[PDB]
Amino acid sequence: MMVIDTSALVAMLSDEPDAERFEAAVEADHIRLMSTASYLETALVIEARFGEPGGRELDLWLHRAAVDLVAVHADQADAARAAYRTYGKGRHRAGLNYGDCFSYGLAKISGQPLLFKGEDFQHTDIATVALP
Amino acid sequence: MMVIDTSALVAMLSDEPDAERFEAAVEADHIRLMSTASYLETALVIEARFGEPGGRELDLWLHRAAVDLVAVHADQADAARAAYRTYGKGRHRAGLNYGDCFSYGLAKISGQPLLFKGEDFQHTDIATVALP
C-alpha cells in the first residue's frame, strides 16, 4: 500500500516538475491511503488556487485512483504528537508542520510508506515511497 | 452536548483572561466532544510552549473533563471543505483557517454547539456555546 501526502497530490494536480513520476508510483501500488485531513488540506489549497472546478478534478482523481480515505483516529494523532517534538519545524529546522502531522500519523500506524514532495519528510523515521 | 475547540482549551491552560468562564461552561454540559485534530493542535501548541510537562497537564484535563476525542471522518472533512469557501479566512477577512475546519466539521456533522475563543467561528452556520 501507500499513503499520499498533500504535497504530492497538489503537485500532481498543479502539474509541477515531477508530476508523471508520482503518477507512476501511484499506479505501481494497488491500495492507496490518504488521511481524511490530508484530503481536506488538499481541497483547500486547490479550490483556492483553481476555484471549484479545480475541486471537481480532485474528486475525479480520487475516484480514478480508488483512494481509501482513512479517518484520523486518536492513535494517529498521538503518534504525530510525539513526532512533532523530534521532527517538527522551528527557527531553521525545516521539518514537519501541522498538515504533515496527519500524513506522518497515518503512515506510522498503517506501517506503510509515504509519497510526498519537499523537504518536510526527508529526515524522518517513516519509510518513503521511492519514485521510478 | 458541546464541541470544544483548540482556542478554548489553550486559553484554559495558559490562564488567559476569560479562562474562568470557559471552565464554568464546560461544567454546565457533561457530554463533551473534541476532534482528534483539535486535540493534536492543542498538544502541539501547549507542548511547544510548556514542554512535555504541559502535555501532561493537557492529558489530565481531557481525562478529568471526560472529553471524547472523535475521529475525523470523510463526512466531517466534506462539510469543512465546503464551509471554508464561504467562511474561510481569505485576504483581509477573519474566519476559519485549516485548523478551525476540524472543529467546524465535527460541530457541523454532530450538530452540536461549539465552544471557542476569538473571532474565527463568530459569523458561521454553526451554534456557539453561551458563555456564563
Partner: peptide, 30 residues
C-alpha cells in the same frame, strides 16, 4: 485503459484552469 493516462488527463485539464488565487500557504494558515 492505463491509470497514469487517466490521471494525466485530470492533471492537464486541472493545471490549465485560471489561477484565481496565486499565493501558496497562508491559504493554509495554522
Amino acid at each position: 485503459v492505463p491509470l497514469r493516462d487517466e490521471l494525466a488527463a485530470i492533471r492537464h485539464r486541472c493545471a490549465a484552469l485560471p489561477v484565481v488565487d496565486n499565493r501558496s500557504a497562508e491559504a493554509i494558515l495554522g
